[PDB]
């Protein structure tokens, strides 16, 4: 598992990518086509919360559901 220590010791420019690599397969399971876009949207959240989302399925799902609701409304209009 990815840990806070691992993230904090990574160069800042790799941190989002490291989180993204672990979040993407989970988000893709939920949304096989929107996964790339939803992952990108979620990666704007701060790193502490992203790590929490990685560790807490209910937390990840709540953020994914909000991003999807907004994205799909955007696509529709």
């Amino acid at each position: 598992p990815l840990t806070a220590s691992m993230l904090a010791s990574a160069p800042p420019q790799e941190q989002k990518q490291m989180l993204g690599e672990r979040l993407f397969p989970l988000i893709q399971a939920m949304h096989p086509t929107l996964a790339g876009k939803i992952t990108g949207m979620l990666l704007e959240i701060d790193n502490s919360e992203l790590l929490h989302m990685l560790e807490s399925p209910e937390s990840l799902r709540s953020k994914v559901d909000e991003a999807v609701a907004v994205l799909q409304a955007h696509q529709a209009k």
Partner: peptide, 15 residues
């Protein structure tokens, strides 16, 4: 968390 529809897509490219 206010979702940003302009956010860059995360492209899987990790191998």
């Amino acid at each position: 968390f206010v979702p940003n529809v302009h956010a860059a897509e995360f492209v899987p490219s990790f191998l």
